Amino acid sequence: NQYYGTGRRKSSAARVFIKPGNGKIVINQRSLEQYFGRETARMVVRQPLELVDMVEKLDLYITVKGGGISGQAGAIRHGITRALMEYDESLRSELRKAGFVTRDARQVERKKVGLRKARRRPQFSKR
Amino acid sequence: ARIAGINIPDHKHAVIALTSIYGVGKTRSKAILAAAGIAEDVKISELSEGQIDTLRDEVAKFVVEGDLRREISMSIKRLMDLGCYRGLRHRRGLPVRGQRTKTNARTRKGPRKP
Amino acid sequence: PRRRVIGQRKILPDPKFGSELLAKFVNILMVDGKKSTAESIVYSALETLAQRSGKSELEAFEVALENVRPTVEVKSRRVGGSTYQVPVEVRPVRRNALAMRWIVEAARKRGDKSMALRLANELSDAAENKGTAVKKREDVHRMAEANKAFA
Amino acid sequence: QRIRIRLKAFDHRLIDQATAEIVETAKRTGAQVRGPIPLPTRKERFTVLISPHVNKDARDQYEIRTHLRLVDIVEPTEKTVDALMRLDLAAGVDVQISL
Amino acid sequence: AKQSMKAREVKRVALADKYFAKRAELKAIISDVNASDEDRWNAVLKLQTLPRDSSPSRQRNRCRQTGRPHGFLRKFGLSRIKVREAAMRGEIPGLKKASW
Amino acid sequence: RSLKKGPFIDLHLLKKVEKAVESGDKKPLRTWSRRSTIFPNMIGLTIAVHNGRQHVPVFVTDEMVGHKLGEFAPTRTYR
RNA sequence: GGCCGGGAACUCAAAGGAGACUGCCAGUGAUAAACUGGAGGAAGGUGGGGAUGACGUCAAGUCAUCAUGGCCCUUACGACCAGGGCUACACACGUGCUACAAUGGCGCAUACAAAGAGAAGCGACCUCGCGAGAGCAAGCGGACCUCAUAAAGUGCGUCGUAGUCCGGAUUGGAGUCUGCAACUCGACUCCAUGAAGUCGGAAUCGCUAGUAAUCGUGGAUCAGAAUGCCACGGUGAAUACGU
């Protein structure tokens, strides 16, 4: 028996599986250190578990696709949050109060005719 | 060190120091160093006399100074004497190889208001 | 704006020392969308400063900031086709922002080898209470003192 | 011996009508079929200037959508192929059969 | 456009269709690496001897309804103005105003 | 231009040059073909080449071989 | 090695649905409309972005995309052809790209995307060339094959404030490809030369969030010719006391 979670951020998707015992992590058949070589990234992936007292009581199996480092980290965190809610169903208050439960939904704005970016406008000359 | 008719710096790696010759670039430098057999991370001031002699012999296979200067000279004056389009431009001081003259052309023209 | 309300945007603590102040400092030092470069510069400079001063990085940083924070500034006004320089107070958040910006601007204009060395030297000089940032603070205080009749 | 049918159109109501007709007719004659799998749509986009002479920031943007469907039948009989080749479809649907 | 400018294109297309086969390979053996020493000298000469209007690169895409030589779309065979008119009247299947 | 294709020249000029050099003549040869390369065979004649308005005469020399005939008939007037 | 048997759970594909309404709790207010907070929820007050342009103004733009009243020429202001010009050069302006470096340049090694196009077309693997390319030659009218390697980043060296191992105009010599034909007047490649410029006077412009700044990718027009136009994603800030 396992516990499941799905996460999304920007253009990235993540699948998370949780079991009990002897904390260890694999992302795409690799360890945290080999995959994420960014301290901010590791801290984001570890935040939800540290917020609770289950740092060393569960095993995690994770897969991810799409986007970049920050987006993938956010997706993984969201997936972990959903999995923990499913598994326990009593940490919802703490997780919500921290803010991990909401789906961040700011995408890239499209380019528009007559502009050179989403909002940048060419130079002007009153003459 | 004094390899060709000129002297060359004695505190920088050889692959760069050789470039001070008029006719050797970053390709010929590496080629000459490889043919001689010296490491390219070498300061010239650490060389011996025989190594320098080998370098001189290697460098003595390309047209380097004086001769190539004369070569470009004769080329340009051959064009000018012939009197073709390129020669006319060469004497008149404007860009050959097309390019715009309504604006720019300042490398071949000079500072504003000659 | 005219009829708007400005809300606070959540900031995230720095990885090793959980310092919101240090996250803000990295942001202000940051340039061109690159954050890792700024983080490396900040950490290297802080480590060398701690080695030089024999205290904690947080303590050294806080002493530097305390020696550069301002308390009164001057704001322009137009009256009778003329300009007056009315003195006004400063809020704590603005104090912090001004201090950090002045420190970074002073550091960027020195002549050492690397930015890390520049920042370490600037922070040490500030801690000893001499340098361009403290000069600027003194000038601001003097210009505020010269205009106390227009309060 | 397996038949594969590919359907293309500019309108999804029409494509659904045609595909339902195909599947029901095929099932009426014994053979078994795997349902219609939907495949990605295609979007072709055009940008045009709307004034006759000079204005460059006035433009219109248009698109065309192409919808696609797949059906496959595995163990047929002799009469099913006859019926399928005899069938008829609407005007705006394109059908391809591969053996 | 002008009637003469329209006739020119018909002439060019006809001549290209006429001499396609001759120009194709019997003359383009110049790219052959083992043809002969100078059995391709005559190839180049008798290639340049042919009419100039038979080379496909001397044709310009014009609108089928008006003749305009600027603003051409290959999918429709028309210019931007006539594309817009037909689209609004509703005569191009599948086309509509797009937004996203 | 690319090698393994050969130089370029027009047949109606090649024939005239061949005839003149085979026989003996000195009157100028008219040409509108500013795009024909100069051959060793052509040394010692006078070719009048078009430039848009008139025919400019060029007297061939050994140093001109391998260029285009159009480099000795300029087309624009200045000062 | 999803490579094999298999499975229909999950990611994903495109069809029918549910959801957000000041609907609920408290306070202010004229028994009113509404306003300021809170709970639950992925989302809260027109949640983010787009299409959508009122009666009218400027005798505003377009007889050269098209159509059309009046005037004008018709052995010519109407056809056909080769060669030139629109690419000129003392000088003045508007929109851009690339710098003037160490938050960096050069070498070696290695993470992580989205959206598009392909029949006279896109073209793999193999051999030859230092290179742009050449010769044979599969697959693909395509969630199947081809275009097709993302870059900034990350690790280890080297350069040590010099007009430099910064910057890259301009010029000589050898070639490649498309095209009947690259002189005037094409794009690329190798060898050599190595310019101005050290953050820019009085003026002056854009931007309130996944925005500005920065790094790469694609498409129409097209035999060949983008730094311009229209699209796509990665990293990702500062400040708003007030009128």
Side-chain angles (χ1 to χ4, degrees):
Chain A
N1 289 326
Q2 333 184 263
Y3 295 110
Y4 187 64
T6 182
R8 307 190 178 100
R9 173 102 164 80
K10 287 220 190 155
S11 53
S12 295
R15 312 153 87 241
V16 184
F17 291 99
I18 271 180
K19 280 283 280 149
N22 186 4
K24 80 183 31 54
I25 307 194
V26 317
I27 296 152
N28 280 318
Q29 327 285 327
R30 305 190 240 161
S31 36
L32 208 71
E33 274 49 85
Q34 325 188 73
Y35 198 72
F36 287 136
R38 224 182 156 199
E39 281 82 0
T40 36
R42 298 129 164 241
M43 163 183 104
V44 188
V45 201
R46 269 180 214 281
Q47 260 179 291
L49 278 172
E50 263 187 357
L51 178 51
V52 202
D53 302 334
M54 301 187 181
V55 174
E56 283 182 328
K57 285 153 221 184
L58 309 154
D59 279 352
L60 275 35
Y61 182 79
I62 311 194
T63 314
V64 75
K65 197 190 334 203
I69 296 145
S70 74
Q72 281 175 357
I76 289 162
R77 174 179 86 171
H78 194 221
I80 292 167
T81 317
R82 267 150 176 244
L84 273 45
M85 271 173 323
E86 221 196 0
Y87 146 69
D88 191 58
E89 182 23 40
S90 300
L91 325 167
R92 207 206 261 283
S93 313
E94 310 307 287
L95 284 173
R96 179 130 219 142
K97 170 176 316 324
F100 298 130
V101 188
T102 86
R103 203 281 198 205
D104 186 313
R106 22 185 200 151
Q107 320 294 123
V108 167
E109 211 178 324
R110 76 167 264 197
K111 203 209 153 258
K112 307 194 229 293
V113 179
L115 305 171
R116 65 192 31 271
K117 285 172 100 199
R119 301 216 186 165
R120 221 257 173 211
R121 187 185 311 266
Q123 195 158 274
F124 175 59
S125 195
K126 172 220 219 176
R127 197 64 36 102
Chain B
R2 165 176 225 252
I3 293 283
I6 54 138
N7 325 58
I8 74 186
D10 309 35
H11 56 280
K12 37 173 70 166
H13 301 177
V15 62
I16 310 172
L18 270 77
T19 39
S20 296
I21 308 311
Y22 172 80
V24 86
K26 195 84 169 323
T27 313
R28 299 194 158 174
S29 200
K30 302 254 289 313
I32 284 155
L33 263 287
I38 311 136
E40 293 182 353
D41 179 349
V42 164
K43 325 190 76 181
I44 300 265
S45 79
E46 309 294 287
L47 263 54
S48 147
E49 227 59 11
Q51 290 154 318
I52 295 170
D53 286 335
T54 36
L55 272 146
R56 292 186 176 114
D57 187 18
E58 295 292 32
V59 172
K61 323 166 101 46
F62 308 116
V63 192
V64 152
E65 286 174 3
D67 295 320
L68 93 167
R69 292 222 166 94
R70 226 176 318 302
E71 278 194 319
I72 329 183
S73 309
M74 335 311 270
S75 287
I76 301 169
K77 302 59 182 201
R78 164 204 174 266
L79 288 164
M80 307 217 228
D81 272 304
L82 226 37
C84 48
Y85 181 114
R86 305 212 275 142
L88 267 56
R89 305 293 292 204
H90 256 301
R91 58 174 72 158
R92 265 154 158 167
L94 294 164
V96 285
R97 315 193 143 179
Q99 287 139 298
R100 170 198 291 279
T101 36
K102 203 172 160 157
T103 303
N104 310 326
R106 300 246 73 93
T107 282
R108 298 280 291 157
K109 270 215 220 170
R112 304 181 173 284
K113 192 152 274 296
Chain C
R2 281 190 192 272
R3 190 213 283 199
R4 288 180 181 161
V5 64
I6 298 97
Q8 314 308 333
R9 202 190 268 100
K10 62 188 339 169
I11 319 301
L12 206 147
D14 203 33
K16 55 209 322 201
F17 334 106
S19 166
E20 282 76 358
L21 260 161
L22 210 77
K24 203 95 209 192
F25 190 42
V26 170
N27 276 341
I28 291 164
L29 197 137
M30 187 193 182
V31 152
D32 229 312
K34 308 168 133 181
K35 207 162 203 202
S36 282
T37 43
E39 272 209 18
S40 93
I41 285 164
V42 165
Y43 291 130
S44 168
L46 270 183
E47 176 264 328
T48 166
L49 192 87
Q51 196 190 7
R52 164 172 317 159
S53 100
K55 260 206 307 293
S56 187
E57 283 107 336
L58 270 65
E59 206 147 8
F61 192 55
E62 206 285 328
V63 167
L65 288 178
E66 247 308 280
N67 267 251
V68 191
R69 268 184 209 122
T71 172
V72 172
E73 84 201 294
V74 86
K75 177 159 51 48
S76 194
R77 239 202 76 92
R78 186 170 287 167
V79 60
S82 192
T83 64
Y84 283 9
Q85 325 227 56
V86 195
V88 63
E89 273 193 356
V90 182
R91 314 169 289 174
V93 317
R94 195 157 158 68
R95 284 145 154 280
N96 276 323
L98 287 168
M100 294 178 225
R101 202 192 306 158
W102 286 337
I103 280 167
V104 171
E105 151 176 20
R108 215 173 285 187
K109 259 183 205 176
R110 305 174 59 102
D112 309 350
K113 289 285 208 232
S114 50
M115 185 75 207
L117 203 64
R118 265 149 178 179
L119 189 41
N121 290 339
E122 194 70 68
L123 278 146
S124 34
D125 264 352
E128 259 145 47
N129 196 297
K130 68 177 137 36
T132 303
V134 302
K135 162 158 59 157
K136 182 129 198 168
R137 193 257 281 151
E138 294 175 325
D139 290 1
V140 155
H141 269 49
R142 277 209 320 271
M143 202 145 58
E145 220 294 293
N147 278 139
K148 197 182 334 293
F150 296 149
Chain D
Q1 298 179 357
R2 173 210 61 196
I3 318 292
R4 260 190 177 165
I5 306 191
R6 263 166 86 81
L7 305 164
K8 275 158 144 213
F10 292 139
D11 194 356
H12 66 279
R13 298 155 202 289
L14 210 73
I15 220 174
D16 288 13
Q17 259 171 335
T19 207
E21 183 295 321
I22 274 278
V23 86
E24 63 88 18
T25 279
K27 294 221 321 284
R28 180 262 303 280
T29 322
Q32 273 69 6
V33 317
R34 270 64 37 201
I37 319 107
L39 291 158
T41 306
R42 192 211 174 162
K43 319 198 169 142
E44 251 185 346
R45 295 186 158 146
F46 317 76
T47 182
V48 170
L49 276 64
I50 60 168
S51 175
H53 188 45
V54 86
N55 299 95
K56 182 68 171 259
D57 275 79
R59 293 198 205 228
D60 256 328
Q61 307 190 301
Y62 306 120
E63 100 185 19
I64 291 165
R65 275 190 219 213
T66 310
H67 307 255
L68 190 59
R69 293 287 178 291
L70 169 62
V71 158
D72 50 0
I73 64 190
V74 288
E75 83 307 18
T77 89
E78 184 61 24
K79 42 168 169 179
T80 76
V81 86
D82 188 22
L84 270 275
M85 228 88 71
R86 166 171 185 184
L87 210 29
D88 82 329
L89 271 71
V93 189
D94 179 24
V95 68
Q96 268 204 349
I97 305 157
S98 85
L99 305 318
Chain E
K2 277 144 75 159
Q3 307 269 82
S4 34
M5 305 291 298
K6 286 170 192 189
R8 294 201 202 163
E9 291 283 320
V10 161
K11 281 190 74 313
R12 270 143 197 171
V13 154
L15 290 191
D17 273 24
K18 184 144 133 189
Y19 288 70
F20 186 69
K22 170 167 283 181
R23 299 183 104 255
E25 61 194 323
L26 306 180
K27 274 55 158 173
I29 65 201
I30 298 138
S31 34
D32 186 0
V33 195
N34 51 18
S36 100
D37 302 342
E38 270 224 346
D39 292 2
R40 55 216 201 161
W41 196 236
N42 330 289
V44 318
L45 288 151
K46 139 207 77 64
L47 170 54
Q48 63 163 262
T49 279
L50 286 179
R52 273 167 144 147
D53 277 324
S54 34
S55 33
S57 294
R58 291 174 70 103
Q59 293 171 7
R60 185 103 191 200
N61 277 324
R62 286 176 185 268
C63 182
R64 287 170 179 243
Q65 287 180 20
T66 62
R68 199 185 206 250
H70 276 289
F72 188 88
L73 280 174
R74 270 163 182 201
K75 178 86 140 163
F76 306 113
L78 287 164
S79 88
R80 35 173 200 96
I81 298 148
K82 299 274 145 182
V83 154
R84 209 222 182 183
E85 308 200 10
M88 284 299 104
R89 259 188 280 116
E91 286 143 23
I92 294 171
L95 196 70
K96 53 201 305 313
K97 299 253 278 159
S99 179
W100 72 92
Chain F
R1 161 137 206 275
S2 83
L3 293 174
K4 66 76 150 186
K5 169 263 187 159
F8 191 72
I9 181 152
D10 35 21
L11 195 36
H12 73 263
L13 183 75
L14 200 55
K15 194 181 280 290
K16 307 172 66 26
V17 160
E18 265 184 12
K19 177 185 305 313
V21 178
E22 174 275 355
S23 182
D25 187 74
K26 294 301 300 301
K27 300 180 277 288
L29 271 57
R30 302 229 292 195
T31 206
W32 287 268
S33 315
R34 303 167 94 271
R35 55 163 184 195
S36 302
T37 323
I38 311 170
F39 279 30
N41 163 353
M42 261 202 271
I43 287 173
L45 305 91
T46 187
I47 327 285
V49 47
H50 206 222
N51 74 323
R53 192 167 28 179
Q54 289 191 6
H55 289 110
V56 170
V58 55
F59 171 78
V60 186
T61 89
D62 156 76
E63 253 296 5
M64 292 174 180
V65 165
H67 280 338
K68 293 294 208 137
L69 262 187
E71 305 205 32
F72 311 110
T75 46
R76 268 175 217 134
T77 300
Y78 184 52
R79 300 308 187 186

